[PDB]
């Protein structure tokens, strides 16, 4: 894990940019603004409150490594995403329409780039009446 923690200290140094060892809401906002994002302050606070376990309001490096350690390909996270798919599922059979998914991904929430959706649709076997088994997506994106 020494190359892993080497990369995690490397990435922590990209946020730190000094010898503090903590990451502030400003210290992340300038990084996000250097990408041309313009996040809100409460967006950054909601972002930062999901990482720390000390309550102080900044992300230390062990908090960074605990976040970077724990796995997306999880028992619970797969079921959360599967329960999230079921809102847009009529009849609950395990299939959603292709154009319904394109209308949702490009309109609702964070609106997707049409090239992103054109990749996302073609990631799954879409034919067979246009229905797609979203657990195929979940196994794909939970392959990690």
């Amino acid at each position: 894990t020494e190359e892993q923690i080497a990369e995690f200290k490397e990435a922590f140094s990209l946020f730190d940019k000094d010898g503090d060892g903590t990451i502030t809401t400003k210290e992340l906002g300038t990084v996000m603004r250097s990408l041309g994002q313009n996040p809100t302050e409460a967006e950054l606070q909601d972002m930062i409150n999901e990482v720390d376990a000390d309550g102080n309001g900044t992300i230390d490096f062990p908090e960074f490594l605990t976040m970077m350690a724990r796995k997306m390909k999880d028992t619970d996270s797969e079921e959360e995403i599967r329960e999230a798919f079921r809102v847009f599922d009529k009849d609950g059979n395990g299939y959603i329409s292709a154009a319904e998914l394109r209308h949702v991904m490009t309109n609702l929430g964070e609106k997707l780039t049409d090239e992103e959706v054109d990749e996302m649709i073609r990631e799954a076997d879409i034919d067979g009446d246009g229905q797609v088994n979203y657990e195929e997506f979940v196994q794909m994106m939970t392959a990690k």
Partner: protein, 348 residues
């Protein structure tokens, strides 16, 4: 394919008067089955009976074998069980085992048991096992199990104490009455086990009347113990009652939720984008417009937002709380005092 889907839905999660009624109808038919099968022991009609009964049993088991298999193949709409191995796993469900055993038992016992004592001793077993399917819905069974699991502690305790006090009061009574003789000449409380039975019969408000203490000491203990511990014994009924009524109430509140939708869309797209990240050549870069260090930090921020949406969505399902109010209010107030310093400062 559409028709099988409709058929499976019709069988599994049906509504409207015809469907529930259909099942009601098959329940009337199995009634006629029992009527004729029990009329078979009435000799004035045993002639008609012997004709319609041997028939009826086979009519049933055949029809049921059919509906079963119809169900199992039409059940392909659920992606878990679509496909061959899918049906095999599908069979893994309990009620599958249930109707399987019912139909196969009727099959074997009416193929060989026709021409025989334990055969009929099994045929009653079958008339029993066939009625099991009348409810058929599984979601709320979980509700029951839940409530039980929640309250396991109390139930356990109450049961412990009541059963225990039974034990004790039984001892004292046995010693009290093991000498008396009933007016009918016998001795009721032969051994401690007798009194124990009597106890448990009592403590649960049955009152058979076969065993009753005689000496005022006995009647005394019976009275005290009964009147006291009986309430403890009936508590789990009351508990579970209130438990269900409560949990039902809260659920009835939960019905209203809508915030789930955009939170879902977000969480989805976050996670997909995260996965798509692992490809450095993916299209997600089109967001930003070479990228020597921005990659890793990007992965960070993406995962972050993902976690946000994830938790938040879980909340997008849970009822509002004074917690939420307090938090968001305090925040908005904070932002506000911030903006006050912003204009105070601007005036500086």
């Amino acid at each position: 394919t559409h028709v099988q889907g409709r058929v499976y839905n019709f069988l599994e999660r049906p509504t409207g008067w015809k469907c529930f009624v259909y099942h009601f109808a098959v329940f009337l038919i199995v009634l006629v089955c029992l009527i004729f099968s029990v009329l078979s022991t009435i000799e004035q009609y045993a002639a008609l009976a012997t004709g319609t009964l041997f028939w009826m049993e086979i009519v049933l088991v055949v029809f049921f074998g059919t509906e079963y298999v119809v169900r199992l193949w039409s059940a392909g709409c659920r992606s878990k069980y679509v496909g061959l191995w899918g049906r095999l796993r599908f069979a893994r469900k309990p009620i599958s085992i249930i109707d399987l055993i019912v139909v196969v038992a009727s099959m074997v016992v009416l193929c060989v048991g026709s021409k025989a004592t334990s055969a009929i001793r099994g045929i009653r077993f079958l008339q029993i096992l066939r009625m099991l399917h009348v409810d058929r819905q599984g979601g709320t069974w979980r509700l029951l199990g839940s409530v039980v699991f929640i309250h396991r502690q109390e139930l356990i305790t109450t049961l412990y104490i009541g059963f225990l006090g039974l034990i004790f009061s039984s001892y004292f009574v046995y010693l009290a009455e093991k000498d008396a003789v009933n007016e009918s000449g016998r001795v009721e409380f032969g051994s401690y086990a007798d009194a124990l039975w009597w106890g448990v019969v009592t403590v649960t408000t049955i009152g058979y009347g076969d065993k009753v203490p005689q000496t005022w000491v006995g009647k005394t203990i019976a009275s005290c113990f009964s009147v006291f511990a009986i309430s403890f014994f009936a508590l789990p009924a009351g508990i579970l009652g209130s438990g269900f009524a409560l949990k039902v109430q809260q659920k009835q509140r939960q019905k209203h939720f809508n915030r789930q939708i955009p939170a879902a869309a977000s969480l989805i797209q976050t996670a997909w984008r995260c996965y798509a990240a692992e490809n450095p050549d993916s299209s997600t870069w089109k967001i930003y417009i070479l990228r020597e260090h921005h990659r890793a930090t990007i992965k960070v921020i993406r995962r972050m937002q993902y976690f946000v949406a994830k938790k938040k969505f879980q909340q997008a399902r849970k009822p509002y709380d004074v917690r939420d109010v307090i938090e968001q209010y305090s925040q908005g107030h904070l932002n506000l005092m911030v903006r006050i310093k912003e204009l105070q400062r601007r005036l500086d």
